[PDB]
């Protein structure tokens, strides 16, 4: 016989049954699931259902308090690779599954884990105490694998693939803390999870391959490898993303943002076309209409032609207006090439085509103040250069290109634009909060400036980074598809970026924000050696994402 | 005359015993052995391949006699048989597909009916084509008032309709007929004056 230190692919190890594996459960599961017809893929000699195959891995740290969850899965055919392959060509399932755990530790450590199976109706949250359920305790010095079987406890006859209903949940948490008696640098171990279908698992209805469903597919296909190291732009400017930078404290950007549910945070449908308005006053300071600065303003609520919200026109930048007066150009901000045009079937004015600074002002045309809230405000635009002709008509509008730049006087270092203390906020939004050690992340890119035309990534002074919230391919992939059931609130969908000398994990919550395990650092992480992206799955927000950089 | 039973009929009979003994189950009854008219639809020369022409859900209202008998029973279970009769002519061409869609799948333009188990219907066939829809349900029975999840029968275009003669006629009528299966039943008799909530129709 094998001496315990080598294990076969069909060897479960020890068997741990808590209280839910009963004979009547299996007898009621087999007999009732015959409403779908005769069972399919039921042959207890095939290689795909006799061996254990790889599902997952996780890490167990010394600093993990008792009662913290390390691994959770709902009951699904996605927990085994071959049933996940076979579920695209079937429309129903029933039965249970087996989970094999191998602890990669030594006989010098200490500590215990605990595993339990939760009934379908119980909410999996913060107030769940899994040590007051029937459970089983596993030592950290175990050499042979331990197998736990989760049965199918359901109130319905079978599980449709597009609508399973209520399912049980397997939870594995910390019983007692991990102890290393020598101390030092070694403070974590690893546990590997394999899976294998149970003897009473089956499929029923044949259907068509790659058929559509009433539920939702996993959000792994939108974020591929060309999105980061190639094509893919920002939400505010059409420039390729170059790097990744964290923020401390959080932010709230609500212009072109889409939730996991299909909904927008106000105006600005996601396409960099143009900015147009039909109502708004025009004026100019001074007694002479020569070499002046044009002054256009209109209240929030005058955007009748916007089909989403009436508060702002389409494609408007969500920047607070920095007040300036005189020939000195403003710092940062949003400036775009534009002109003016008059109402009542009117042609645009020839004599005034100039770059204007866009923003929201308070108390115009008197003392102009920056504003953080969009409700009860008034959109504004004023020129930075001198034009030779001014208009003073009450009906007037704008014509500004959607792509823009930043205006800076000195242009040596400045500051990444925009800041979280400058991004405006629509009514009804949830704000970013750093949970765990994970911090809100904002994508960085390269945008030209008015102070220097040649803004190349290299020498001749350090470059400036514009920051946008989410990529425009990602926003397109969420503006149509609804993901109410793809990811439960309270956790995030985590990927795994792999560089040439390290790896990091990035997340995506239900709020549409991205999380990384940066901690308290504000260093730009340049994405130049990144090769490939492999998705992982749904991970709880309390867990720490890795930051192995060389 | 042979009567067709469903593939899931033995599990369908046993799990409907939570409603009591089966009612109106007599295999020699004249309301049960013959096919009767249900509906009619149109197949046009302008229909693209893959377009849906007919869609019906599993219900005891797709038959003139199970709809009368459902006024006095609070529950039903079992399958139902469909038949298709093309008016047609010998100068036409084109085929159709019919398949049963399980619950949980969309019915829409992206549905590929030709990769389900299906039957093929010709534009100039004289004998009718028959397909059986089983009761694939996640419940023990279907209560009248709130049934649950049901399968759906979908008719689509395989090859488009062709008239080589020319003008005038450009549309064909197809008639649907229905008789119940061997495993269909009722449970739990009730007052006929009770819930009168029947698909209100602007026909009267």
């Amino acid at each position: 016989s094998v001496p315990g230190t080598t294990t076969d692919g069909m060897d479960p190890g020890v068997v741990a049954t808590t209280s839910v594996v009963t004979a009547e459960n299996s007898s009621a599961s087999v007999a009732t699931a015959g409403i779908g017809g005769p069972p399919q893929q039921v042959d207890q000699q095939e290689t795909w259902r006799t061996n254990f195959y790889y599902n997952d891995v996780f890490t167990w740290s010394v600093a993990d308090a008792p009662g913290s969850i390390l691994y959770t899965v709902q009951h699904s055919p996605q927990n085994n690779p071959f049933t996940a392959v076979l579920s695209q060509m079937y429309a129903g399932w029933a039965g249970g599954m087996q989970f094999r755990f191998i602890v990669a530790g030594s006989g010098v450590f200490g500590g215990r884990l605990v595993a339990a199976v939760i009934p379908p109706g119980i909410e999996i949250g913060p107030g769940l105490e899994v040590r007051q359920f029937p459970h089983v305790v596993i030592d950290a010095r175990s050499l042979e694998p331990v197998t736990i079987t989760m049965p199918d406890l359901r109130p319905n006859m079978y599980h449709p693939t597009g609508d399973p209903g209520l399912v049980p949940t397997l939870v594995l948490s910390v019983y007692n803390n991990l102890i290393n008696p020598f101390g030092g640098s070694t403070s974590a171990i690893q546990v590997t999870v394999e899976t294998r279908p149970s003897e009473d698992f089956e499929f029923v209805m044949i259907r068509a391959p790659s058929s559509k469903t009433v539920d939702s597919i996993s959000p792994a296909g939108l974020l591929t490898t060309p999105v980061l190291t190639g094509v893919g732009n920002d939400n505010r400017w059409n420039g390729q993303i170059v790097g990744l930078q964290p923020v401390p404290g959080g932010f709230s950007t609500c212009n072109r943002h889409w939730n996991l549910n299909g909904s927008t945070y106000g105006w600005s449908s996601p396409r960099f076309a143009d900015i147009d308005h039909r109502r708004g006053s025009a004026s100019y300071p001074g007694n002479n209409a020569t070499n002046v600065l044009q002054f256009w303003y209109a209240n929030a609520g005058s955007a009748i032609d916007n089909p989403i919200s009436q508060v702002a026109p389409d494609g408007f930048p969500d920047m607070s207006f920095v007040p300036f007066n005189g020939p000195g150009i403003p710092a940062a901000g949003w400036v775009g090439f534009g002109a003016i045009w008059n109402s009542n079937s009117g042609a645009p004015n020839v004599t005034t085509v100039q770059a204007y600074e866009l923003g929201f002002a308070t108390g115009a045309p008197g003392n102009l103040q920056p504003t953080t809230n969009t409700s009860g405000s008034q959109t504004v635009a004023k020129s930075i250069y001198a034009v030779v002709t001014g208009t003073a008509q009450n009906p007037a509008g704008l014509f500004v290109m959607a792509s823009g730049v930043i205006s800076t006087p000195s242009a040596n270092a400045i500051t990444y634009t925009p800041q979280p203390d400058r991004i405006v906020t629509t009514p009804g939004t949830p704000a970013a909060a750093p949970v765990g050690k994970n911090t809100p992340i904002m994508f960085a890119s390269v945008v030209r400036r008015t102070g220097d035309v040649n803004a190349t990534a290299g020498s001749a002074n350090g470059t400036q980074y514009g920051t946008g919230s989410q990529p425009l391919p990602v926003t397109i992939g969420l503006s149509l598809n609804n993901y109410s059931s793809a990811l439960m609130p309270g956790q995030f969908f985590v990927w795994q970026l792999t560089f040439a000398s390290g790896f990091m994990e990035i997340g995506l919550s239900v709020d549409g924000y991205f999380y990384a395990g940066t901690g308290a650092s504000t260093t730009l992480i340049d994405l130049t050696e990144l090769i490939d992206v492999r998705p992982v799955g749904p991970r709880p927000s309390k867990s720490t994402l890795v930051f192995n950089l060389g | 005359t042979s009567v067709v039973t469903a593939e899931n009929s033995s599990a369908s009979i046993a799990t409907a015993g939570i409603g009591g003994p089966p009612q109106q189950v007599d295999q020699q009854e004249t309301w049960r052995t013959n096919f009767y008219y249900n509906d009619v639809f149109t197949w046009s020369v302008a229909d693209a391949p893959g377009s849906i022409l007919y869609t019906v859900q599993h219900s005891p209202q797709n038959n003139p006699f199970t709809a009368v008998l459902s006024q006095m029973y609070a529950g039903w279970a079992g399958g139902m048989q469909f038949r298709f009769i093309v008016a047609g002519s010998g100068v036409f061409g084109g085929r159709l597909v019919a398949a049963v869609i399980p619950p949980g799948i969309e019915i829409g333009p992206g549905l590929e009916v030709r990769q389900f188990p299906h039957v093929v219907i010709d534009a100039r066939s004289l004998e009718p084509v028959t397909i059986t829809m089983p009761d694939l349900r996640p419940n023990m029975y279907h209560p009248t008032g709130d049934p649950g999840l049901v399968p759906t029968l979908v008719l689509s275009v395989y090859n488009n309709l062709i008239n080589p003669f020319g003008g005038s006629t450009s549309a064909i009528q197809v008639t649907v007929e229905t008789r119940p299966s061997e495993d269909f039943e009722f449970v739990m008799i009730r007052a006929p004056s009770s819930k009168t909530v029947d698909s209100i129709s602007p026909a009267g």
């Binding site: 007898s27 007999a31 | 033995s10 046993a14 015993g17």
Partner: peptide, 10 residues
């Protein structure tokens, strides 16, 4: 309980 499985078997 036994009669249910007995009927389904028979």
């Amino acid at each position: 309980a036994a009669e249910f499985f007995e009927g389904m078997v028979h």
